[PDB]
Design a protein around this ligand. Structure first.
Ligand SMILES: CC(=O)N[C@@H]1[C@@H](O)[C@H](O[C@@H]2O[C@H](CO)[C@H](O)[C@H](O)[C@H]2O[C@@H]2O[C@@H](C)[C@@H](O)[C@@H](O)[C@@H]2O)[C@@H](CO)O[C@H]1O
Ligand SMILES: [Cl-]
Ligand SMILES: [Hg+2]
Ligand SMILES: [Hg+2]
Ligand SMILES: [Hg+2]
Ligand SMILES: [Hg+2]
Length: 264
C-alpha cells in the first residue's frame, strides 16, 4: 500500500563496517531479522508504523484460575506494550465478570470474549501470548511483520538434535533430527491477521488429524507451531528477550533487556 514519506530525522548514522552485535545472530538464513536490543532504532520504526495508523490486537486466554493473572498482565502491558499505537486487547475467558477493571491509555481498548472476520476489520496485526506473564520492558512495533515466532528461552543455544520437537512420524507435527532452524515458543507469536489465521487454521487441522489417529504431540500446540514455522519461515524472529524466565534462567550477558517474563 501507499506509504507517505518519513519526516526529517536526526539519529546516529548506521555503520556498515561495524556489526550490530558480534555475540548473536541477527538475521536468519532466509533473511528475516532476529530482534535483539541494539539492532533497531525504535524512533524510525515508530514513525513508519504510526504513519500507517497501525492497530495491534493482543490476544490472551484466561480460563479458570488463570484469570488471577489478568490484572498484572494488563497493567504492565499498558506501560510497555505498543505504547503510542492503537491497541485492542482480546481477553478470552470463562469468567467475564472476573476480568479486572484496568485503566487504559487513550487509543487502547479491551474486549471480553466469553468461551474470525472480526479480527480482519478491527486490527492490522495479532499478537498471541500467555496470560501468566508480565511486561518488564519495551515490546513495540519492532516485532510487527507478516509472521513472527519467538526463540524459546531454554533452547536458543541448543543443537536441533536437542530440540523437543515431536519426533514420532505418526504425528503431523513430526520433525526429524536433521531438520529444524530454531525452537519457537508457543506462548508468543503473531503477525498480520491473515497470516495468524492461516497458522491457526493449519494447526487446528493438524491437531484434528492427530486426534483421529489417536496421537497427541509431545508439546501440543507448541509442537505444531514449530512444524508450521519450519515449513513457513517467519518474516521476523524475536530473541529470548521477548519471553524470559529469570528465576529459572537468570540474566545472561547476551540479554540486554528482559521485556516479557513468566510470573513465579
Ligand atoms: C533441555 C531442557 O533442560 N529443557 C528445559 C525446558 O523444557 C524448559 O521449558 C519448557 O520447555 C517445554 C518444551 O520443551 C515447554 O515449552 C514448556 O512450556 C517450558 O516450560 C515453560 O516455560 C519455561 C521458560 C518456564 O517458564 C517454565 O516455568 C514453563 O513451564 C526450560 C524452562 O523451564 O528449561 C529447560 O532446561
Ligand atoms: Cl492467544
Ligand atoms: Hg546495531
Ligand atoms: Hg491469537
Ligand atoms: Hg501447524
Ligand atoms: Hg499452532
Amino acid at each position: 500500500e501507499f506509504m507517505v514519506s518519513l519526516p526529517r530525522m536526526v539519529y546516529p548514522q548506521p555503520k556498515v563496517l561495524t556489526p550490530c552485535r558480534k555475540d548473536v545472530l541477527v538475521v536468519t538464513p532466509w533473511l528475516a531479522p532476529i530482534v535483539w536490543e541494539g539492532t533497531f532504532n525504535i524512533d524510525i520504526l515508530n514513525e513508519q508504523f504510526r504513519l500507517q495508523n497501525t492497530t495491534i490486537g493482543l490476544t490472551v486466554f484466561a480460563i479458570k484460575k488463570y484469570v488471577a493473572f489478568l490484572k498484572l498482565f494488563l497493567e504492565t502491558a499498558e506501560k510497555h506494550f505498543m505504547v503510542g499505537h492503537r491497541v485492542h486487547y482480546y481477553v478470552f475467558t470463562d469468567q467475564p465478570a472476573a476480568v479486572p477493571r484496568v485503566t487504559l491509555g487513550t487509543g487502547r481498548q479491551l474486549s471480553v470474549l466469553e468461551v474470525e472476520r472480526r479480527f480482519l476489520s478491527e486490527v492490522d496485526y495479532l499478537v498471541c501470548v500467555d496470560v501468566d506473564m508480565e511486561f518488564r520492558d519495551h515490546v513495540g512495533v519492532e516485532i510487527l511483520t507478516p509472521l513472527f515466532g519467538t526463540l524459546h528461552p531454554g533452547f536458543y543455544g541448543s543443537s536441533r538434535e536437542a530440540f523437543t520437537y515431536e519426533r514420532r512420524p505418526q504425528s503431523q507435527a513430526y520433525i526429524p533430527k536433521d531438520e529444524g532452524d530454531f525452537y519457537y515458543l508457543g506462548g508468543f507469536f503473531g503477525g498480520s491477521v491473515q497470516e495468524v489465521q492461516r497458522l491457526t487454521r493449519a494447526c487446528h487441522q493438524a491437531m484434528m488429524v492427530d486426534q483421529a489417529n489417536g496421537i497427541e504431540a509431545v508439546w501440543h500446540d507448541e509442537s505444531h507451531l514449530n512444524k508450521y514455522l519450519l515449513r513457513h519461515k517467519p518474516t521476523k524472529v524475536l530473541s529470548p528477550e521477548y519471553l524470559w524466565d529469570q528465576q529459572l534462567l537468570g540474566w545472561p550477558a547476551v540479554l540486554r533487556k528482559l521485556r516479557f517474563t513468566a510470573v513465579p
